[PDB]
């Protein structure tokens, strides 16, 4: 990959393997979710990064997803090239956003589209802060100056309330624990395992007969390498739309909430 | 990737992701068999194919067993080449055997082997090769052996033991989600590597590293079943592996693996 001419975003070509495919012959959301990260970290690594700027790294600050937003129009079969541009913006005292545009090499159309807004952080205490002005001067000469949407529209998906979802649940699936595979370099639970999660509770029939179309997710706890999640999952609604709630087996405490948008195959 | 100037091997470069790597900054065993598995189907696929013979007579190519040695993990953003290739074992079954190196020096950090069986796929019955068969594969194959693990009496050739109650370490209640299926709906064999590392202590993963894992498949599991991991030290560190159904206490698989101190 490499950053583009006037180097405010980063492009990326994958070409989509064999065990990233589905039941449809066609990469996972998943998957894809897996590659918006990868071409996130490089770059975050094309800036100089390491996303931590210099005055983060010194005030043990991090940064956290708070909200992911995916919108799949076409999922690429295996063997395909997929091409992906990233690109960052401040979104003042708030946080930042990073946002993604996914395209068919071959014919240059747009197949997907993903937003994400992030969260700055204590490492330590896990408290949530508002962004400092040393740090936002740090990050901004990265950033387009003009907004640069993935969603323009104005009354998009991406920006909606999710409400939490009231027992009992129509779907569930209980006693959800992650491997080692499902955690990063730092041991914690990678956010692409929370999308699985949340889609182990989609009955199979929805699987056979529908193909996701948009996922929106609210992360509000992080689960910890020893912890037990229960995935529940309500009917809201041609096209089928889900409510989501992730939450701890015990207390049930909420890790996560979550929406999804299902179309007719 | 690309076949080989003879045509009786395939060659692919990987660049290690950021999520493909573990608590040492380096791509795991689980994503090293993927790659393996990758480079295999497009080996597969840059040959014509199951070949035709086998499509008629609903006939599938399934591992009996999986060897890995890994000498150098390689780090997020390094360039590994996998090199593959097929080996009739006569009517026993086929052979695919890969060589791991690192891009930039050349060196040899990985090589591994497995055994494939031929299996009827609505039956599940084993039922040895034919010859039919093999005179359309065997023109994929070097004449000559060609080993990844040549020495007279090596690790991959090793008969595992049965490990008996009461095991040292567990890990129970593990089940398979949609990620961990394929496109036909099984379940993927490098789960079940995942699944064995699982009842590995945290100790042992803090102070050494995974270098050999070999693997036995007897049964697979079902997308609705419920796995125990099982570990007991036998020794470097050397462990004994059992995996088997929640249940009945059913075999799916054993194994060993061999850890080096950090
Ligand atoms: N991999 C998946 C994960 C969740 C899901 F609901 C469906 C699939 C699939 O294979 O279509
Ligand atoms: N990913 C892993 C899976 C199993 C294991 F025993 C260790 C790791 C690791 O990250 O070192």
Redesign the pocket.
């Known amino acids: 990959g490499s950053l583009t001419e006037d180097g405010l975003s980063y492009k990326e070509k994958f070409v989509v393997r064999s065990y990233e495919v589905g039941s449809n012959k066609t990469a996972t959301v998943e998957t894809i979710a897996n590659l918006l990260q990868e071409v996130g970290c490089n770059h975050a690594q094309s800036v100089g990064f390491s996303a931590t700027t210099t005055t983060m790294r010194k005030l043990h600050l991090i940064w956290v997803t708070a909200r992911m937003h995916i919108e799949i129009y076409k999922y690429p079969a295996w063997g395909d090239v997929v091409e992906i541009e990233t690109w960052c913006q401040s979104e003042g005292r708030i946080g930042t956003r990073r946002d993604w545009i996914l395209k068919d090499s071959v014919t240059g159309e747009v197949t997907g589209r993903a937003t994400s807004k992030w969260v700055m952080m204590n490492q330590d205490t896990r408290r949530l802060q508002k962004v400092s002005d040393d740090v936002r001067d740090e990050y901004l000469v990265f950033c387009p100056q003009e907004p640069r949407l993935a969603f323009p529209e104005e009354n998009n998906r991406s920006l909606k309330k999710i409400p939490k979802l009231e027992d009992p649940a129509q779907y569930s699936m209980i006693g959800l624990k992650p ?3 499902d ?1 990063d370099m730092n041991q914690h639970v990678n956010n692409v395992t929370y999308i699985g999660w949340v889609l182990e509770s989609i009955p199979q029939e929805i699987v056979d007969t529908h193909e996701l179309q948009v996922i929106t997710l609210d992360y509000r706890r992080e689960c910890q390498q020893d912890d037990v999640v229960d995935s529940l999952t309500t009917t809201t609604s041609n096209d089928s739309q889900f409510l989501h709630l992730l939450r701890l087996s015990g207390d049930g405490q909420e890790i996560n909430r979550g929406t999804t948008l299902w179309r007719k195959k």
Do not use: G, T, V
Request: charged residues 50%.
């Open positions: 491997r080692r595979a955690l």
